[PDB]
Design a binder for this molecule. Structure first.
Ligand SMILES: *C(=O)N1C[C@H](NOS(=O)(=O)O)CC[C@H]1C(=O)NOCCN
Ligand SMILES: *C(=O)N1C[C@H](NOS(=O)(=O)O)CC[C@H]1C(=O)NOCCN
Ligand SMILES: [Cl-]
Ligand SMILES: [Cl-]
Ligand SMILES: [Cl-]
Ligand SMILES: [Cl-]
Ligand SMILES: [Cl-]
Ligand SMILES: [Cl-]
Ligand SMILES: [Cl-]
Lengths: 267, 267
């Protein structure tokens, strides 16, 4: 009944704000899961940047790239919302610094630079996800056009379950070695954009790493997280939302409440 | 929960002054530790000069340099805050005297001279730290640019834990031989800049060697110390702080208080 009760609550919440909520959560201790619309497609928005950073780290661990190599872009016309890359344009940034900027500040210049030079574009990003056994994720376009969030459009989408599974494999599993995995975890823990979302759904003293997305159309926003509860095995939580109308604004509170519901469902 | 109690106290202290405090402390006699934000990055400021001095001593021990060789610089335009090098510009200084000046007086001319001629610049300084198994420390720039302490900037940072571990290895461990280690200890014991920080958190008759950092922007300041309590095995304490606003001044009192808290946490 517990799963059906949680589903009832998400359904009401999505109706309350005239939109659509997709959830997948895992208690990695018990194996218990909860899903709601967990196989439906939602726009990725900036959330894919969390996976981009993991792809960089994999290349680093395979010795194909060096985390400390200098990335120069002195001549580049920086994309909108490049707060970190803008500041270091004169000096360059290390590959590590650029990747973590993409994740923690949603820096679009950092994102496009990495895809152009190191990852093989949206195709290469998709191939990375295929390489870890994620068959749902697809990135089709570059920043910022990947953020259109048009209803029914399959471009630049994944599913809540596929996102949760991939995050589990990357942040907690075997894809990255112990050393590089710890770097990835630290990057997620230092994300700056997620304070009103999954982070808002758990006690102050639980440790959270997350990445958000906020397309800026169709009230489309999301969050995924690895949560370390005090003295317990970690949780994985993946929350994706869309809204009916183009001009609808996203709802952080809806995301946080859906997170609260999912966490109880697997408890 | 003695750890949890101490964490609550540091958290409150950082909220009190609208900033961020990172702590790592070791009782070398029991191996007990306490950490708070101990894996987060903080600007090194002048504190790296304590490690620069150790790097010089290692070169001396390897017979790549002589502690008494004359270092001349009669034509040099000395960096701001070079009180010791300024006084011997006409005659030169011994390598040992120059290195101890860098540590005990935060002499910027001493610092840059040593990095230019003997250590291979910021890259060589970083290589030294890597050579003792410190994987977090990074020096990217020269004096005085390394002191900008821009929020979110990873240049010229380390973590409290890595700083404490490295200080343990250098001041108390096996990197330097018994003879050269004694010189390093004496240099730290004679630091002149740390009276209001870790030194202020222990009794007058405990022996302390330390190095401070005071970036001079973003209320960014720090201290690390080896402490010999009367009749007890030595302690290692590492305290790093930042503040929210550019014009915020550093807080010696907050550093001293965080040190008091850390020392109790491990006792
Ligand atoms: C990512 O989806 N971004 C970047 C930025 N912050 O990331 S968030 O914390 O995840 O929201 C806000 C804008 C957003 C977009 O680039 N959206 O594009 C809107 C029109 N293309
Ligand atoms: C070491 O931390 N510093 C900080 C200094 N900037 O702080 S400021 O001088 O107050 O602006 C730059 C280099 C180095 C020192 O020279 N330290 O001594 C300066 C006075 N505490
Ligand atoms: Cl960052
Ligand atoms: Cl989209
Ligand atoms: Cl805080
Ligand atoms: Cl010698
Ligand atoms: Cl020189
Ligand atoms: Cl130089
Ligand atoms: Cl700095």
């Amino acid at each position: 009944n517990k799963s059906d009760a949680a589903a009832k609550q998400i359904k009401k919440l999505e109706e309350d704000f005239d939109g659509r909520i997709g959830v997948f959560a895992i208690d990695t201790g018990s194996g218990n899961t909860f899903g709601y619309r967990s196989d439906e497609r939602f726009p990725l928005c900036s959330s894919f940047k969390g996976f981009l950073a993991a792809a960089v780290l994999e290349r680093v661990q395979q010795k194909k790239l060096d985390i400390n190599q200098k990335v120069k872009y002195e001549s580049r016309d920086l994309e909108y919302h490049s707060p970190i890359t803008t500041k270091y344009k004169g000096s360059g940034m290390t590959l590590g610094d650029m990747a973590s900027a993409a994740l923690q500040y949603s820096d679009n210049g950092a994102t496009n630079i990495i895809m152009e030079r190191f990852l093989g574009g949206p195709e290469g990003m998709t191939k990375f996800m295929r390489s870890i056994g994620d068959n749902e994720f697809r990135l089709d376009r570059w920043e910022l056009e990947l953020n259109t969030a048009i209803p029914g459009d399959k471009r630049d989408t994944s599913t809540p379950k596929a996102v949760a599974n991939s995050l589990n494999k990357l942040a907690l599993g075997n894809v990255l070695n112990a050393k590089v995995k710890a770097i990835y975890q630290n990057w997620l823990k230092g994300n700056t954009t997620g304070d009103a979302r999954i982070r808002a759904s758990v006690p102050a003293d639980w440790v959270v790493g997350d990445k958000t997305g906020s397309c800026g159309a169709y009230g489309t926003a999301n969050d995924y997280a690895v949560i370390w509860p005090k003295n317990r095995a970690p949780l994985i939580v993946s929350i994706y939302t869309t809204r009916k109308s183009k001009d609808d604004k996203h709802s952080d509170k809806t995301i946080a409440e859906a997170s609260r519901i999912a966490i109880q469902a697997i408890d």
